[PDB]
Amino acid sequence: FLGLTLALSKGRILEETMPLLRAAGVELLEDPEASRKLIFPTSNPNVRVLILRASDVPTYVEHGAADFGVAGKDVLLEHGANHVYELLDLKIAQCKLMTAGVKDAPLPNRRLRIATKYVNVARAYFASQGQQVDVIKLYGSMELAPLVGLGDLIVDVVDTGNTLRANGLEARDHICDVSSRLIVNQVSYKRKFALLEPILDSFKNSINS
Amino acid sequence: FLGLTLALSKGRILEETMPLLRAAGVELLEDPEASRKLIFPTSNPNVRVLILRASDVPTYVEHGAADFGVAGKDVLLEHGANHVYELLDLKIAQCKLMTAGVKDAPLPNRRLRIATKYVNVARAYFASQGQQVDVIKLYGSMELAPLVGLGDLIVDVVDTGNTLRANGLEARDHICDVSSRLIVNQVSYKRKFALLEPILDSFKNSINS
Ligand SMILES: Nc1ncnc2c1ncn2[C@@H]1O[C@H](COP(=O)(O)O)[C@@H](O)[C@H]1O
Numbered sequence: 001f002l003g004l005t006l007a008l009s010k011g012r013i014l015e016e017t018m019p020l021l022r023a024a025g026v027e028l029l030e031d032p033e034a035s036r037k038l039i040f041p042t043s044n045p046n047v048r049v050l051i052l053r054a055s056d057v058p059t060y061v062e063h064g065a066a067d068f069g070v071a072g073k074d075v076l077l078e079h080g081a082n083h084v085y086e087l088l089d090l091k092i093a094q095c096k097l098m099t100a101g102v103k104d105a106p107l108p109n110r111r112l113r114i115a116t117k118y119v120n121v122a123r124a125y126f127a128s129q130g131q132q133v134d135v136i137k138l139y140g141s142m143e144l145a146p147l148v149g150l151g152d153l154i155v156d157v158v159d160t161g162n163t164l165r166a167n168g169l170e171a172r173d174h175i176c177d178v179s180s181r182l183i184v185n186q187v188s189y190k191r192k193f194a195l196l197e198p199i200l201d202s203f204k205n206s207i208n209s
Numbered sequence: 210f211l212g213l214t215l216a217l218s219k220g221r222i223l224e225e226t227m228p229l230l231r232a233a234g235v236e237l238l239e240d241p242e243a244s245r246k247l248i249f250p251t252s253n254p255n256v257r258v259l260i261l262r263a264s265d266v267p268t269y270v271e272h273g274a275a276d277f278g279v280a281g282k283d284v285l286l287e288h289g290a291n292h293v294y295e296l297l298d299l300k301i302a303q304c305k306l307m308t309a310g311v312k313d314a315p316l317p318n319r320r321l322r323i324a325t326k327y328v329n330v331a332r333a334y335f336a337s338q339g340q341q342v343d344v345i346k347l348y349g350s351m352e353l354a355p356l357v358g359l360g361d362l363i364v365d366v367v368d369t370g371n372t373l374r375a376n377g378l379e380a381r382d383h384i385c386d387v388s389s390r391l392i393v394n395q396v397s398y399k400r401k402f403a404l405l406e407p408i409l410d411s412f413k414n415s416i417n418s
């Protein structure tokens with residue numbers, strides 16, 4: 001396969017990317033959510049889609065196993081974006097990285113323990129606040145950690161805040177806003193520009209409203 | 210809450226642990242798979258259950274946010290088991306860590322690139338074969354990596370082999386057998402032994418057939 005390989009993830013990113021792709025003349029021929037398949041053809045025979053864990057999107061793109069991809073800023077910040085090109089803020093799958101803890105609980109007067117998936121983001125943010133912190137690396141369900149005393153705060157993505165509230169937690173600090181971003185393999189950008197360019201211009205045009 | 214907190218994961222581990230718990234007089238009062246809840250009470254008011262990512266099970270137990278837990282040997286090996294006590298091989302959720310690649314594809318004559326979730330296990334295994342390898346860290350769907358040329362082999366857990374076959378991959382090497390294990394917090398073992406002991410003896414008795 002000699003065309004372009006696009007790396008996406010399930011849920012919000014796939015949902016919200018699909019209209020951008022359609023306007024660029026790319027449509028999936030089935031629902032990837034309902035399939036065990038991994039590589040998907042599209043209406044354009046120069047473009048195929050990988051469905052990955054959101055976490056693996058920047059990895060596949062960096063190594064050139066995908067030519068380009070849609071990844072959240074949270075994931076890009078955590079992974080490091082030094083070896084891909086961020087070309088667009090797609091303004092989709094919008095949320096915030098926040099810190100949070102048990103509602104009205106006081107912070108202990110000592111080095112804080114941060115339970116999070118976003119270990120690099122947690123360390124960098126607390127460094128900006130004057131705090132060297134310990135991080136407990138986790139993989140899901142951060143909202144449980146403070147309820148069983150695993151760490152003093154969490155760092156996680158928050159959209160509505162309903163998860164936090166449901167668990168008697170509240171956001172303490174806003175870290176940054178997060179949205180999905182168009183990333184490109186640094187070599188594919190050079191070698192496959194004529195394939196990429198009309199799709200990038202289409203996306204840019206679509207985002208302009 | 211002053212009793213015992215048991216850390217489990219969804220799917221196979223929960224399914225297969227449940228009969229051991231029942232025989233020990235512990236039954237969940239609802240299906241955790243059908244709930245957004247995180248902490249679950251049981252029929253025994255001294256025992257509650259956390260439902261975690263399999264990856265977070267050893268973490269919660271190490272830090273004492275759970276007193277004990279059921280984790281797969283694959284996860285224990287990857288995480289490191291130096292700060293919990295492995296008390297039982299439960300002989301459940303049985304599978305193998307294997308290496309695998311594209312069917313009949315030759316290995317390149319150079320330093321191999323291993324796409325895997327199990328970076329430590331991959332490095333340790335290939336070291337035993339005389340190979341220093343590069344590892345590409347991934348989070349799911351390892352069976353895609355060799356189909357798009359991300360690395361030369363994968364390391365992953367294999368049960369039936371159907372996933373590998375479905376994707377035109379084959380197991381190259383058997384690394385080790387994997388089963389779920391009963392782990393205990395090193396302090397909870399000392400402080401809460403009278404609570405733990407009858408549950409451990411029950412599990413030991415059940416496994417004996
Ligand atoms: N844009 C997003 N990308 C990824 N995960 C998200 C996003 N927005 C919310 N989440 C997660 O989805 C769940 C629901 O978020 P919330 O609406 O804040 O309760 C939480 O576990 C969040 O971490």
Ligand SMILES: Nc1ncnc2c1ncn2[C@@H]1O[C@H](COP(=O)(O)O)[C@@H](O)[C@H]1O
Binds near residue numbers: 366371
């Ligand atoms: N005991 C196990 N624990 C966790 N994951 C497993 C286990 N057995 C199989 N899997 C995974 O489940 C899928 C089905 O495995 P298989 O039956 O080998 O096709 C693969 O993605 C395996 O990595």
